[PDB]
Design a protein around this ligand. Structure first.
Ligand SMILES: *[C@@H]1O[C@H](CO)[C@@H](O[C@@H]2O[C@H](CO)[C@@H](O[C@@H]3O[C@H](CO[C@H]4O[C@H](CO)[C@@H](O)[C@H](O[C@H]5O[C@H](CO)[C@@H](O)[C@H](O)[C@@H]5O[C@H]5O[C@H](CO)[C@@H](O)[C@H](O)[C@@H]5O)[C@@H]4O)[C@@H](O)[C@H](O[C@H]4O[C@H](CO)[C@@H](O)[C@H](O)[C@@H]4O[C@H]4O[C@H](CO)[C@@H](O)[C@H](O)[C@@H]4O)[C@@H]3O)[C@H](O)[C@H]2NC(C)=O)[C@H](O)[C@H]1NC(C)=O
Ligand SMILES: O=C(/C=C/c1ccc(OC(F)(F)F)cc1)N1CC[C@@H]2CN(C(=O)[C@@H]3CCc4[nH]nnc4C3)C[C@@H]2CC1
Ligand SMILES: [Ca+2]
Ligand code: NA
Ligand SMILES: [Zn+2]
Length: 804
């Protein structure tokens, strides 16, 4: 109940929250149906429109008018945005040449440059170039300020998950808005786009920018706008708030536009109808900048122009139906569209089985346009699993497609030509970032980056300490002229042991064998030097990774590779080696096919054993440093050490052997040498974070050898590929992957074919940032380079996407 009998007199767009049942006058009162009876008359005036004309100049103030052209309007802070152009001979902001803003030029009484976030729904990255002719205001912001060619959204590339990731710095799995539609099984409640459940504070987690600002004494405009409030009125409200007395005036503001998303859904991303919504957005930008110029704020305010996600061509005829796959379609609930999420229709149904559902959805039709996954098996780069609101079964839908339960859902619910939601590396889903103002750089292009990183920068722009989030603070310092945040490297927590030769061969009883008993002060001093680290500068190019948690581990050196061997997990945490462009690939000689060799630096009690692999009928083993890339026949023996061995399913060994035998050499050819760091990952609770020993759900049968959920590699070379990876003077280039360690290749529908037709495609799907690996392993890479630390942080957030 709302006692709508109160009044909005002197309260239009008030900032304080006012509680039930007293009526409201704020920018969301419409959406709640709680506005005072006179909100429309007083607060949403429309009379005479939004623009001054010659004859209104100097007019007698008439308070009924939407905006004013009277002489007192500047002091009242309510002129039409074009007042000074029409009535005082001024230019539009867009018509002025851009001039570097070296220092803020703010009016008396401004304690910091204000931040205005101009957010646009459905604004596809390629609109910046393709619509540039019809968007002169936005084009001036882009060209004169700091811009990226695109900004990567979070998955799913839906509206509320991305707007709230913008506000919080968090993955949707952490902030809790994992879809526009959700079911929370603990609340037993459904969240929808439409209706009242979404207003409940229990859905939204983390700490959004407006709350961070308020807790730290920086005042915030109300960021959200009811749909029926016209954009002109939104702009005028922001400009009015900017004329408040100093102690009342917010320092951070947001504008939101439902366009171009609204028309994009109707007409597709490049429909000819799309020009007009782009023109309209640009005019709104021009209104704001003109108004800032009137307030003498256009060289004081930092403006961010930022989108949530792109838009793809999608029509009704490109829908897959689950009724074409499942016998029992009525036993499931599907969340449909550009992603699918499946759960049981009734919790009392004991004949529900996720395994039979996944199997019935796996590689069933040759052209099949979605792929099913248990959520723990989704590419780790999506970070889309650790929340009870994400259903166990997920369908990753191909771009341009939908999934639905039954055909009647599509016609008895084409209506549309565009949609979004797909995998966040898809080019059509990319969106925009421009920053303009005294704190941003001048005419500067920055590489693409992820929207999770923006919250830290917005905190930096406002002098705020960010709440804990998933950005990597300092990774975007290159966007800023000042206010940079100068991080320090984490301290290493565990220091390694450096074992020498301490065990005789006969102390081991591992059940391993090797035909190695074939055999010189010349070559012996040499191999002793190798075991003490004499080649370590070649293979460990950026320093040893730091172990950021408490553990017990050994550094082991060899001719061709170096490793940090965990005595707790009985295998390396990391293995580092460099492969030059000139390096040669060799076979595993026939006498060495099954060779495993005890490591005399490491005790039997801290070693794996071959008997456990013989007895485990599901598990085989592979090696981290590949025997194919040995520098010489004699060095090859080091690759068969028990301390280089890791547990691998035979299906996974197909993937790993092709990567090691074929791909590493290909990368070394193409990139002029590569440095590789490989290793295991254990993430059994799918939280994106390194497991502790007591979280491990599976061991090699009969043993304490833990089975990895994933294997990673980080592959680094010189950005200037005219220099070899091992003699690089400048910035680096990196690509990485986190491959799921699965006992089948059901994910790859073409896997019965030769690895050359499917392995690299799998690896590309499981592309990762170095930072993703850091979280999953508790390691910190690139500790010793000649690069600035902020540049290294940017390198660790890079994602190699393989989109063209
Ligand atoms: C991306 O960045 C974010 C932010 O930095 C990272 O998330 C953090 O990760 C931490 C580890 O997973 C986690 O720390 C835990 O906090 C627990 C208290 O949590 C509450 O308080 C905080 C602070 O205000 C609050 O933010 C939390 O909010 C969560 O939960 C509510 C739902 O109630 C949501 O609205 C909200 O969105 C958020 O949910 C998300 O996180 C939770 C986990 O907290 C998930 O369950 C959700 O699915 C969702 O993703 C909370 O309200 C604290 O209790 C934990 O301590 C346990 O473990 C330690 C070991 O050190 C030990 O001291 C304790 O014994 C304790 O164990 C006990 O609980 C066990 C489980 O019940 C039980 O088995 C034991 O027997 C014990 O009783 C822990 O320190 C932190 O909460 C989140 N923060 C956020 C905002 O999510 C994220 O990791 C980053 N991602 C990547 C990939 O890097
Ligand atoms: O105006 C906006 C969006 C503004 C915006 C600005 C900046 C930004 O990025 C930044 F954060 F980085 F700046 C992100 C979003 N929208 C989109 C979001 C929803 C929220 N809503 C509700 O009704 C809310 C639902 C949830 C909720 N909980 N308490 N009040 C509310 C209102 C209807 C709808 C209003 C129109
Ligand atoms: Ca984990
Ligand atoms: Na397959
Ligand atoms: Zn949309």
């Amino acid at each position: 109940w709302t006692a709508t009998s109160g009044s909005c007199k002197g309260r239009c767009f008030e900032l304080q929250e006012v509680g039930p049942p007293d009526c409201r006058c704020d920018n969301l009162c419409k959406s709640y149906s709680s506005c005072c009876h006179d909100f429309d008359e007083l607060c949403l005036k429309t009379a005479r429109g939004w623009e001054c004309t010659k004859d209104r100049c100097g007019e007698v103030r008439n308070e009924e008018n939407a905006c004013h052209c009277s002489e007192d309007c500047l002091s009242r802070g309510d002129c039409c945005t074009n007042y000074q152009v029409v009535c005082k001979g001024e230019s539009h902001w867009v018509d002025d040449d851009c001039e570097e803003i070296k220092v803020p030029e703010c009016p008396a009484g401004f304690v910091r440059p204000p931040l205005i976030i101009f957010s646009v729904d459905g604004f596809r990255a390629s609109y910046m170039k393709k619509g540039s002719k019809v968007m002169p205001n936005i084009e001036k912001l882009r060209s004169c300020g700091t811009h990226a060619p695109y900004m990567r959204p979070v998955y799913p590339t839906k509206t509320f998950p991305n707007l709230y990731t913008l506000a919080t710095g968090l993955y949707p799995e952490s902030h809790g808005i994992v879809g526009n539609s959700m079911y929370d099984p603990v609340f037993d409640a459904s969240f929808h786009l439409r209706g009242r459940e979404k207003f409940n504070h229990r859905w939204w987690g983390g700490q959004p920018l407006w709350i961070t600002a308020t807790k730290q004494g920086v005042r915030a405009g109300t960021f959200f706008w009811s749909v029926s409030i016209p954009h002109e009125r939104r702009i005028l409200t922001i400009l009015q708030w900017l004329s408040l007395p100093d102690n009342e005036r917010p320092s951070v503001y947001a504008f939101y536009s439902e366009q171009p998303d609204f028309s994009g859904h109707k007409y597709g991303p490049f429909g000819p109808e799309m020009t007009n919504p782009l023109r309209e957005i640009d005019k709104t930008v021009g209104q704001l900048m003109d108004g800032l110029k009137q307030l003498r704020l256009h060289r004081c305010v930092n403006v961010i122009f930022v989108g949530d996600h792109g838009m793809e061509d999608v029509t009704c005829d490109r829908t897959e139906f689950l009724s074409n796959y499942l016998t029992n379609v009525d036993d499931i609930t599907l969340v449909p569209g550009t992603l699918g999420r499946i759960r049981a229709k009734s919790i009392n149904n004991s004949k529900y089985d996720p395994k039979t559902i996944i199997a019935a959805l796996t590689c069933k039709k040759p052209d099949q346009h979605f792929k099913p996954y248990m959520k723990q098996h989704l590419p780790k780069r999506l970070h889309y699993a650790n929340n009870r609101r994400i259903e166990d079964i997920h369908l990753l839908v191909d771009r341009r497609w939908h999934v639905a339960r039954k055909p009647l859902d599509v016609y008895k619910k084409c209506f549309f030509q565009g949609d979004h939601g797909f995998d966040n590396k898809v080019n059509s889903m990319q969106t925009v970032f421009v920053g303009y103002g005294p704190t941003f750089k001048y005419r500067t292009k920055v590489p693409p980056f992820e929207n999770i990183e923006l919250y830290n920068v917005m905190c930096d722009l406002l002098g705020l300490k960010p709440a804990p989030n998933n950005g990597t603070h300092g990774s975007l310092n290159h966007l800023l002229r000042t206010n940079t945040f100068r991080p320090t490297m984490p301290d290493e927590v565990s220091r390694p042991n450096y074992p020498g030769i301490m065990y005789l061969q006969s102390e081991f009883d591992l059940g391993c064998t090797c035909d190695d008993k074939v055999e010189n002060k010349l070559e012996e001093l040499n191999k002793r030097l190798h075991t003490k680290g004499s080649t370590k500068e070649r293979h460990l190019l950026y320093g040893r990774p730091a172990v950021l948690y408490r553990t017990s581990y050994d550094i082991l050196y060899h001719t061709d590779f170096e490793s940090g061997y965990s005595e707790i997990f009985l295998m390396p945490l990391w293995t580092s080696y460099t492969i030059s462009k000139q390096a040669e690939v060799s076979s595993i000689p026939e006498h060495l096919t099954n060779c495993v060799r005890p490591d005399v630096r490491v005790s039997p009690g801290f070693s794996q054993n071959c008997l456990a692999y013989k007895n485990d009928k599901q598990m085989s083993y592979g090696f981290l440093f590949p025997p194919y890339l040995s520098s010489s026949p004699e060095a090859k023996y080091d690759a068969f050490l028990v301390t280089n061995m890791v547990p691998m399913y035979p299906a996974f060994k197909r993937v790993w052997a092709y990567f090691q035998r074929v791909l590493v050499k290909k990368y070394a050819s193409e990139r002029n040498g590569v440095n590789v760091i490989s290793g295991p990952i254990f993430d059994y609770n799918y939280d994106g974070l390194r497991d502790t020993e007591d979280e491990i759900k599976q061991y090699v049968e009969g043993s304490s050898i833990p089975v990895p959920t994933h294997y990673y590699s980080i592959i680094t070379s010189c950005l200037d590929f005219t220099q070899p990876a091992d003699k690089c003077d400048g910035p680096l280039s990196v690509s990485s992957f986190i491959l799921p360690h699965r006992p089948d290749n059901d994910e790859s529908c073409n896997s019965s074919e030769d690895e050359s037709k499917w392995v690299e495609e799998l690896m590309k799907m499981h592309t990762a940032r170095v930072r993703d690996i850091e979280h999953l392993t508790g390691l910190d890479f690139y500790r010793k380079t000649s690069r600035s630390y902020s540049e290294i942080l940017t390198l660790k957030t890079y994602l190699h996407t393989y989109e063209s």
